[PDB]
Amino acid sequence: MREIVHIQAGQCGNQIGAKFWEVISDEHGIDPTGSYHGDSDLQLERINVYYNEATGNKYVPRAILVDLEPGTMDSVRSGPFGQIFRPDNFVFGQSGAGNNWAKGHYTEGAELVDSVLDVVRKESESCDCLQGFQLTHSLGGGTGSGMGTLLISKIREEYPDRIMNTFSVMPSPKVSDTVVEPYNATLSVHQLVENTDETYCIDNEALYDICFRTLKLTTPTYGDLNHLVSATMSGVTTCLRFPGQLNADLRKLAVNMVPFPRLHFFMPGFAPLTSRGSQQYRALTVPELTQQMFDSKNMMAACDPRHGRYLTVAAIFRGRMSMKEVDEQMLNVQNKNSSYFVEWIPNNVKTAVCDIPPRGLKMSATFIGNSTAIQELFKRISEQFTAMFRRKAFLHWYTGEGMDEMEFTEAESNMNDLVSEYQQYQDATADEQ
Amino acid sequence: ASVKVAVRVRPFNSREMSRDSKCIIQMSGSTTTIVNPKQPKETPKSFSFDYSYWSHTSPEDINYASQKQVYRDIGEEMLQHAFEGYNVCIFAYGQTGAGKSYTMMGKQEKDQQGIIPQLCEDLFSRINDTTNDNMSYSVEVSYMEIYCERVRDLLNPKNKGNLRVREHPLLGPYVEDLSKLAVTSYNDIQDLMDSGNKARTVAATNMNETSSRSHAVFNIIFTQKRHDAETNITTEKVSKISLVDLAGSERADSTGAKGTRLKEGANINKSLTTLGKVISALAEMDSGPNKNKKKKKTDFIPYRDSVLTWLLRENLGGNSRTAMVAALSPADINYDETLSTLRYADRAKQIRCN
Amino acid sequence: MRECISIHVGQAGVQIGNACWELYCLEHGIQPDGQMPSDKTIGGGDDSFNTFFSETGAGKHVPRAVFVDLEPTVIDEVRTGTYRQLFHPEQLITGKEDAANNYARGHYTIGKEIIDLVLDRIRKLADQCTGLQGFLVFHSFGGGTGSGFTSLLMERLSVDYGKKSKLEFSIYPAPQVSTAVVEPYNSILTTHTTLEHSDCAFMVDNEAIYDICRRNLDIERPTYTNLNRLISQIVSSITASLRFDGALNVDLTEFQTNLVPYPRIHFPLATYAPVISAEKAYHEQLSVAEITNACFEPANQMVKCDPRHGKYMACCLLYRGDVVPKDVNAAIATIKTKRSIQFVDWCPTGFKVGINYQPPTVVPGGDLAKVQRAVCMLSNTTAIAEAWARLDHKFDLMYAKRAFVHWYVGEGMEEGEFSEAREDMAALEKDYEEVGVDSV
Ligand SMILES: CC(=O)O[C@H]1C(=O)[C@@]2(C)[C@H]([C@H](OC(=O)c3ccccc3)[C@]3(O)C[C@H](OC(=O)[C@H](O)[C@@H](NC(=O)c4ccccc4)c4ccccc4)C(C)=C1C3(C)C)[C@]1(OC(C)=O)CO[C@@H]1C[C@@H]2O
Ligand SMILES: Nc1nc2c(ncn2[C@@H]2O[C@H](COP(=O)(O)OP(=O)(O)OP(=O)(O)O)[C@@H](O)[C@H]2O)c(=O)[nH]1
Ligand SMILES: Nc1nc2c(ncn2[C@@H]2O[C@H](COP(=O)(O)OP(=O)(O)O)[C@@H](O)[C@H]2O)c(=O)[nH]1
Ligand SMILES: [Mg+2]
């Protein structure tokens, strides 16, 4: 039994995790009270992947909620699915990080890390065969970055062989709500590239553009972005919970998408997306899904694939469909857009097909890209970093917590090195003399 | 950045001579060829290396690679490089009983010694000879072990905790709270090496009860100090000479134990693969500009894929000389281990034979 | 008497086994639950043919097979599907993770501690037997479970059952269609065990079967079920000589004697001629000559290779249904006069023939038309090297930079094994080239 432990630290991660549990409970037919009222027996075939059984037939999510402030915890508990969680797993403090990485990692998180790791150990011991971990956290700078990387470091030390997964919202240039984003982003990504095994980049600007252009919404809110991220998260772990003609377990992906250990930053996407106004005019089929899948506007990281080349791609289909159609469509995408794909790799489109589509769709698809452009997402942050590190703009708050200056330089150098390896393989040729 | 690879053959030991033990490795100038013992008559597989050394039989006047000849070939030139001011790295690789200690350390009688005693003795002698009233030399040493991608101290008798690794912006990678003791003569170095080799982590496996489980580094830092009279000493050049003991590559069938043994074997295999990749790309880079000239911008060496290649960043490239020694077991019983050793030795710019 | 053990490893082998056992139960009259009304109604005969089933006292029929896997998701479908009551509950499933498309994980990190149970179950099955003839291992290249566990299991069974034949049926990577990024590594690692231990390893390709489905069956969007049914028909045609009466029967030892000139060239292609839809079943005669000619058409081959770019060195035609030796001899005489079909100078006999009286059985809800006659052609030919050669090219482009190797070395493997496998495949290709050169 492949079962996963879920953690959620910070405000953004907690909100996304709440919507994720909403979506998962809807998929598996779990009421907010924790009881089953679904339709098909297949929902109970692999309920233990995310849930744990409780004596009165009930089901408790295998979730651990973390935050330094109590507001997000109260908001989640005072919510639609607030009562589904285990109260003993609500570990939190009473002093916020104040958008301070040093405060989250070194001073305030050091006191709580023992409690969160004790709860994580209790949850992990009960599992028959643990597969991996999940952790939702934004790189804004508060509880998320600091205590998330602390948790990843501790768990990687404790469980060196179980697959680690994270879902993160990168900073954006046009959408920003705090003044110290680049520092926290660089400091967090140092530990992420050191420790994690898969990280799925998410950008608020891309989600807003998807909302305005593809979904044609008028006044999007955070709920829609959490909905999209939840769709991606559910799509990634579809083959552990339902059967299909071709299974794509998390470790299969870990082998397939990652050529070298450090290039494990991925670009997510979902299809179909119709805007509730052009639903009648669209023909939902595998060729059309593939057309929407490899479109620049449909990716959530705010990067242009046309400004790079793909190292790897994974298309997790869900529904009843022919394998010839999928294979031919992936081959056509390879041949028609050959200039945007790496040459050394003979085939770089992993394929997965599941038998149980979403609740209200005949078929759906999840996209997991790995391309060079992603450099442009990191590169901009580095520029901003220099623009505030040339003068030590706000470092005196971090140094107060006991962080030396050199750590910033180390993290910046690691950023630059990671950018250099994505370009290493991105000019399209490599020969002549 | 030039890489020179050497492979050496050892004599039989007491156990091998006690049993019915043949010789299976043949060497001609620079080409080494193996022949299967349990399936003859197929085709002795052949490889080419930068140096092939025959110390098997005895001082056989005809083509017998003495220890001093290997020293003059590798260690003396790289010691000249170290004295010039640039960095140096030396690797030792091979399975248990393959005879890598016979080359690195050698016999204790100091008549047919290893690379390390000759290198240290010549270093101290040249330091003594040129020590005039102005030029001042300093030598310091340290010893660390890389175990499951964690650095541990071998000289300090504290509890075996994991030290931290940092990147100084100018001095490059380094290790925090690493013990560093000064030396004056080879006797202190020998005592430190004995204590460190006693302190290292080993475990019993299905091939040897005291098989290595971790990589090791003996770093020696050499500092020059000019003493012109004007107003300054001008530290001038700081040259590092590093010695690396590499654990043997492992297959799960040989080490079938579950738990810590499998994890250790996997980490050793990953680290060795990354090290070979880095050395191969380094050799290609050295060959190109030397002959080709295409500054090829800088391409990119994956220097951050492991801790062993990360700590030795300043010695493995930029401007320095690298070398490696692979010991071969001549017995047929260890044919697979020897074949794996040659297969690893094929790295660092494989060349053409026949 | 005449008994074979059918082992299925991985998702591909398990699903082909589902199709195979569906077809066998349909052929023999055994209902899914495993009961057989024919014996109790008649009280005579031997409809419980021992080649695939064992009969208990109560009248049930347990198939002779073990369905090994590492993901519960596939075997649990069988354990709760239509045929839940057919099999022994000893399905040999591993309560752990998958091979993750890693040969090492299948071989010697996760495969261990479960191979003992698989071998013990095979020991019990063979001890129940009295006239065991061979094994039928179903797997597929390109997968960690397939390659690794088939290699380990074949090694153990060769050490334990070295005197018994071991047939293999496998799916090879297509020239362009592929559903994973590490298929060449897995196939190359499978080379060094499929060659030495298996006595005759059969090959199929998905792209060729898709083309067959499109051109003949007129299915524009086929899925894996049709491919599995075609493979099941091929295996049934191969094995029919051991069960039903026939004028010219062929045993497995006869197959190995006729199709294998030298030990290292036991890798023939297989094909089925009358793969025709019901709509086009009319407007045609489907005589012996027509099906025999259709067998040698390049379009009808199930591996993407050109027969015209080589020379046949062995051919074995297994006919089923209303056939007589006169028509077969006439068809072979017709084929021998064609210039395109070129035969080696050292095989003057050329063709082997067998005939059986049992026609093909139509699976309900399938796509193959009812036909009075059918033929399965096995062909040892030199063209297959091309299907190998392209794959090596893929491997080369993936090994000049050590991409994805660290996942394999992190599970107990060295980078020299890749070179060992590459040289073994090169030796196989050179031997195949050597065989076809005309003598003087
Ligand atoms: C015409 C019809 O059938 O109604 C659809 C619908 O109109 C559309 C527009 C839906 C609709 O989605 C949105 O409008 C939307 C807006 C912002 C962010 C996300 C979604 C729908 O809301 C979403 C909803 O989707 C689901 O039920 C999926 O299962 C989805 N979400 C949930 O199950 C869910 C559960 C609890 C609470 C909220 C949502 C899902 C997708 C992947 C993995 C798991 C779940 C459906 C059927 C519709 C509506 C209701 C209008 C779409 O749904 C998705 C995300 O697949 C958006 O584009 C698709 C295409 C559909 O045609
Ligand atoms: N003909 C046919 N081929 C299949 C089928 N299912 C999977 N395949 C092929 O099998 C290949 C994967 O190799 P497998 O050995 O089957 O993978 P697996 O059985 O799931 O084993 P793991 O990789 O360990 O999960 C894919 O490239 C598919 O093309 C099937 O049902 N029919
Ligand atoms: N998608 C999403 N992003 C959010 C939400 N709230 C805040 N953010 C992003 O997160 C960043 C702030 O990080 P935050 O979560 O507040 O840090 P925390 O104090 O650890 O919780 C901002 O730059 C926002 O872009 C939300 O509800 N949804
Ligand atoms: Mg599988």
Same domain, yes or no: C262 and C309: no
**Active-site residue, B75 included:** no
Q: Measure the CA–CA gap between C114 and C69, rounded to whole angstroms.
A: 10
Q: Measure the CA–CA gap between B241 and C51, rounded to whole angstroms.
A: 71
Q: DSSP class of residue C114?
A: T
> What phi and psi values does residue C137 have, to the nearest 5 degrees?
-90, 125
Amino acid A330 reads M
Contact B300 A160 (CB under 8 A): no
**Residue among A16, A9, A6 at smallest CA distance from A112:** A9
Q: What three-state secondary structure class fits C406?
A: helix
How many inter-chain contacts (A to B, CB under 8 Å) are there? 26
Ligand 3 atom nearest the C-alpha of A147 is: 20
Q: What is the CATH number of the domain that holds A287?
A: 3.30.1330.20
Contact A424 B299 (CB under 8 A): yes
Q: Measure the CA–CA gap between C325 and A19, rounded to whole angstroms.
A: 72
- Our measurement of the distance from residue C279's CA atom to the centroid of its chain's CA atoms, rounded to an integer in Å, reads 29
Ligand 1 atom nearest the C-alpha of A279 is: 62
Q: Measure the CA–CA gap between B304 and A419, rounded to whole angstroms.
A: 13
Q: Measure the CA–CA gap between A374 and A91, rounded to whole angstroms.
A: 35
> What phi and psi values does residue B322 have, to the nearest 5 degrees?
-120, 150
Residue of C nearest to A131 (CA): C97
**Active-site residue, B245 included:** yes
Alpha helices per DSSP H over chain B: 14-18, 67-70, 76-84, 100-104, 115-129, 186-199, 260-287, 307-311, 313-316, 335-345
Q: Is B176 exposed, middle or buried (0-12, 13-18, 19+ CB in 10 A)?
A: exposed
* Length of chain B (residues): 354
**Residue among A346, B74, A287, B177 at smallest CA distance from C396:** A346
The two structure tokens encoding residue C90? 């000893």
Provide the strand spans (E) within C126-275. 132-138, 165-172, 200-205, 269-272
| Residue corresponding to tokens 């299991």 | C153
C10 has binding-site annotation: yes
Same domain, yes or no: A326 and A243: no
Who contacts C134 (Cβ-Cβ below 8 Å, separation ≥6)? C4, C164, C165, C166, C167, C199, C252
Q: Measure the CA–CA gap between B69 and B54, rounded to whole angstroms.
A: 11
Catalytic residue among B75, B94, B196, B248: B248
CATH architecture for residues B3-345: 3-Layer(aba) Sandwich (3.40)
Same domain, yes or no: A250 and A313: no
Amino acid C277 reads S
Who contacts A114 (Cβ-Cβ below 8 Å, separation ≥6)? none
**Residue among B73, B29, B126 at smallest CA distance from B321:** B73
Cα dihedral C50, C55, C59, C65 sign? negative
The two structure tokens encoding residue A180? 């110290």
* Length of chain C (residues): 440
DSSP letters, C268-313, are: -EEEES----STTTSS----HHHHHHHHT-GGG-SSS--GGGS-EE
Catalytic residue among B99, B106, B276, B317: B99
Cα–Cα separations (whole angstroms), residue A1 to A105, A109, A251, C107? 34, 33, 14, 21
Whether B266 and C410 have beta carbons less than 8 Å apart is answered as yes
The two structure tokens encoding residue B171? 């001095």
Q: Measure the CA–CA gap between A27 and A191, rounded to whole angstroms.
A: 34
Contact B274 C405 (CB under 8 A): no
- Our measurement of the distance from residue A250's CA atom to the centroid of its chain's CA atoms, rounded to an integer in Å, reads 13
Within 10 angstroms of residue A16's Cβ, the number of other Cβ atoms is: 26
A160 reaches C (C-beta below 8 A):
no
Same domain, yes or no: C339 and C282: yes
C96 reaches A (C-beta below 8 A):
yes
Who contacts A395 (Cβ-Cβ below 8 Å, separation ≥6)? A389, A405, A408
Whether A230 and A50 have beta carbons less than 8 Å apart is answered as no
A424/chain B closest Cα distance in angstroms: 7
Contact A406 B166 (CB under 8 A): yes
Report the nearest-CA residue for atom 23 of ligand 2: C143
Range of the domain at C321: 269-383
The domain total for chain C is 3
* Nearest residue, CB atoms, C406 vs list B251, B252, B273: B273
Same domain, yes or no: C63 and C208: yes
Same domain, yes or no: C247 and C373: no
Range of the domain at A321: 260-373
The two structure tokens encoding residue A158? 């404790």
Q: Measure the CA–CA gap between A372 and A427, rounded to whole angstroms.
A: 10
Who contacts C211 (Cβ-Cβ below 8 Å, separation ≥6)? C299
Q: What three-state secondary structure class fits C412?
A: coil
Whether C375 and C327 have beta carbons less than 8 Å apart is answered as no
Within 10 angstroms of residue A429's Cβ, the number of other Cβ atoms is: 6
Of A323, A347, A373, the residue at which a domain comes to its end is: A373
Three-class secondary structure assignment of C304-340: CCCHHHCCEEEEEEEEEECCCHHHHHHHHHHHHCCCC
Q: Measure the CA–CA gap between C426 and C389, rounded to whole angstroms.
A: 9
Whether B82 and B107 have beta carbons less than 8 Å apart is answered as no
| Residue corresponding to tokens 């009648």 | A280
Whether B269 and C410 have beta carbons less than 8 Å apart is answered as yes
Within 10 angstroms of residue B202's Cβ, the number of other Cβ atoms is: 13
Of the bound ligands, which one is closest to the alpha carbon of residue A221?
3
Amino acid C333 reads A
Ligand 3 atom nearest the C-alpha of A177 is: 23
Residue of C nearest to A286 (CA): C221
Alpha helices per DSSP H over A210-322: 222-236, 250-257, 286-293
Half-sphere exposure of A164 (CA within 13 A, CB side): 25
Cα dihedral A332, A336, A340, A341 sign? positive
Helices (H) and strands (E) in chain C, counts: 16, 11
Gyration radius of chain C over CA positions:
21
Instruction: Report chain breaks in chain A, C–N > 2.5 Å, as residues after which they occur.
Output: none
Whether C181 and C136 have beta carbons less than 8 Å apart is answered as no
| Residue corresponding to tokens 């490893």 | C9
Amino acid A6 reads H
Q: Can you give the residue ranges of every domain in chain B? A: 3-345
- Our measurement of the distance from residue A381's CA atom to the centroid of its chain's CA atoms, rounded to an integer in Å, reads 19
Q: What three-state secondary structure class fits A209?
A: helix
| Residue corresponding to tokens 């991996």 | A132
CA dihedral C6, C10, C14, C20 (to 10 degrees): -50
| Residue corresponding to tokens 């405060």 | A103
Ligand 1 and A237: CB distance under 6 A: no
Q: What is the CATH number of the domain that holds C144?
A: 3.40.50.1440
The two structure tokens encoding residue A316? 């997790």
Resolution in A: 2.7
* Nearest residue, CB atoms, C414 vs list B249, B256, B262: B249
Whether C427 and B280 have beta carbons less than 8 Å apart is answered as no
The domain total for chain A is 3
Q: Measure the CA–CA gap between C64 and B152, rounded to whole angstroms.
A: 56
Same domain, yes or no: C277 and C416: no
Q: Measure the CA–CA gap between B156 and A224, rounded to whole angstroms.
A: 57
Cα dihedral C416, C420, C425, C427 sign? positive
Q: Measure the CA–CA gap between A302 and A169, rounded to whole angstroms.
A: 11
> What phi and psi values does residue A308 have, to the nearest 5 degrees?
180, -165
Q: What is the CATH number of the domain that holds A386?
A: 1.10.287.600
Q: What is the CATH number of the domain that holds C330?
A: 3.30.1330.20
Cis peptide before B40 (omega within 30 of 0): no
Same domain, yes or no: A173 and A315: no
Whether B117 and B123 have beta carbons less than 8 Å apart is answered as no
Q: Measure the CA–CA gap between C66 and C17, rounded to whole angstroms.
A: 10
Ligand 1 atom nearest the C-alpha of A234 is: 43
Report the nearest-CA residue for atom 4 of ligand 1: A360
Q: Measure the CA–CA gap between B265 and B207, rounded to whole angstroms.
A: 13
- Our measurement of the distance from residue C416's CA atom to the centroid of its chain's CA atoms, rounded to an integer in Å, reads 30
Amino acid B101 reads S
Q: Is C65 exposed, middle or buried (0-12, 13-18, 19+ CB in 10 A)?
A: buried
Cα–Cα separations (whole angstroms), residue A196 to A113, A190, A264, B275, C97? 18, 10, 8, 22, 20
Which H or E element spans position C236? helix C224-239
Of the bound ligands, which one is closest to the alpha carbon of residue A140?
3
Residue of A nearest to B165 (CA): A410
Same domain, yes or no: C158 and C280: no
Q: Measure the CA–CA gap between C122 and C136, rounded to whole angstroms.
A: 12
Same domain, yes or no: A78 and A219: yes
Half-sphere exposure of C5 (CA within 13 A, CB side): 25
Contact A261 B305 (CB under 8 A): yes
Whether C328 and C290 have beta carbons less than 8 Å apart is answered as no
A336/chain B closest Cα distance in angstroms: 29
DSSP letters, A386-417, are: HHHHTTTSSHHHHHHHT--SHHHHHHHHHHHH
The neighbours of chain C, by the rule of 3 or more Cβ pairs under 8 Å, are A, B
Who contacts A100 (Cβ-Cβ below 8 Å, separation ≥6)? A141, A142, A146, A397, A398, A401
Q: Measure the CA–CA gap between C134 and C125, rounded to whole angstroms.
A: 13
The experimental method, as deposited, was cryo-EM
> What phi and psi values does residue C57 have, to the nearest 5 degrees?
-65, -40
Residue of A nearest to C180 (CA): A350
| Residue corresponding to tokens 């369905």 | C67
Whether B10 and B329 have beta carbons less than 8 Å apart is answered as yes
- Do β-strands C373-381 and C312-321 pair in parallel, antiparallel, or remain unpaired? antiparallel
Three-class secondary structure assignment of C372-392: CEEEEEEEEECCHHHHHHHHH
- Our measurement of the distance from residue A255's CA atom to the centroid of its chain's CA atoms, rounded to an integer in Å, reads 18
Of A259, A290, A313, the residue at which a domain comes to its end is: A259
DSSP letters, C30-47, are: --TTS--HHHHHH--S--
Q: Measure the CA–CA gap between A222 and A140, rounded to whole angstroms.
A: 15
B22 has binding-site annotation: no
Q: Measure the CA–CA gap between C222 and B286, rounded to whole angstroms.
A: 54
Within 10 angstroms of residue A306's Cβ, the number of other Cβ atoms is: 11
A416 reaches B (C-beta below 8 A):
no
